[PDB]
A paper describes a structure:
In EGFP residue Asp190 is located in a long loop (ten residues) that spans one end of the β-barrel structure linking β-strand S9 to β-strand S10. Thus, the structure of EGFPD190Δ allows us to investigate the structural impact of a deletion in a loop. The crystal structure of EGFPD190Δ encompassed residues Lys3–Thr230. The backbone trace between the two structures starts to diverge after the deleted residue and does not converge back to the general structure until Leu195. This also results in a significant displacement of the side chains of these residues. Therefore, in the present context the main backbone changes are exerted immediately after the deletion and are not propagated either side, with the placement of the flanking β-strands unchanged. However, deletion of Asp190 alters the conformation of this loop, repositioning it so that the backbone N and O atoms of Val193 are within hydrogen-bonding distance of the carboxamide side chain of Asn159 in the adjacent tight turn linking β-strands S7 and S8. This results in the linkage of different secondary-structure elements in EGFPD190Δ (S9–S10 loop to S7–S8 tight turn) compared with EGFP (H3 to S9–S10 loop), potentially being the reason for the reduced B factors of residues in these secondary-structure elements in EGFPD190Δ. Overall, there is a net gain of one hydrogen bond between the residues in EGFPD190Δ compared with EGFP. Thus, the deletion of a residue within a loop does not just cause general loop shortening: a whole host of local and long-range interactions are lost and formed so as to accommodate such a change.
EGFP is an archetypical autofluorescent protein in terms of structure and function. It comprises a core β-barrel capped at each end. Running through the centre of the barrel is a kinked helix that houses the distinctive p-hydroxybenzylidene-imidazolinone (HBI) chromophore. HBI forms as a result of covalent rearrangement of three residues resident in the central helix (Thr65-Tyr67-Gly68).
Author numbering: 3 to 64, 68 to 189, 191 to 230
Amino acid sequence: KGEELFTGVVPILVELDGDVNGHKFSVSGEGEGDATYGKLTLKFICTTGKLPVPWPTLVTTLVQCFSRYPDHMKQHDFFKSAMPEGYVQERTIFFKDDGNYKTRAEVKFEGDTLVNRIELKGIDFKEDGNILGHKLEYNYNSHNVYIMADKQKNGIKVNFKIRHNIEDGSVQLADHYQQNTPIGGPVLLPDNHYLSTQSALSKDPNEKRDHMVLLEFVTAAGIT
């Protein structure tokens, strides 16, 4: 099954094409994932120069097939079951009192490498709000990512809210609506559960380009 593709360390490639309020940018990432630990190591570069939005706002867009599904949870791992053909991941992300992102990604193997290829469109932002004004702290918090079967088609529906810490001490919420559908034949759909997701963001002091180093940790768990 798809799960067998994830028993060891897997190389990852990420490519994101973005446009936020007409500000166009691209991001390239590379690294590796180890799903038997639930761990990601990635480095992202803004290949168009300086990123026009805060790096933390792109974390969720920039591979949930690397989550650790413990044995008792394994039948309910949609993300790996869809591999190697992969899945389409679509989101709408609403920044409270500000604009929204819409994203479409394909997450799939290309040879030995797990690829996440994304298009992102952002609209309705304030040019000196928290996003386009760069007012978000360079950090990330712990979230629970809630997963249900889609009733209408073979896929999952996923819901969570991200808490982005603002530099003046407040929190910028980002409500995420997500759906995933297989690129290949249908899969068995999971019972309701969640992913416990932790992300930590850092810098390489020797890297001169605008970039983000990102280590994540993710484990599935049952409800409640």
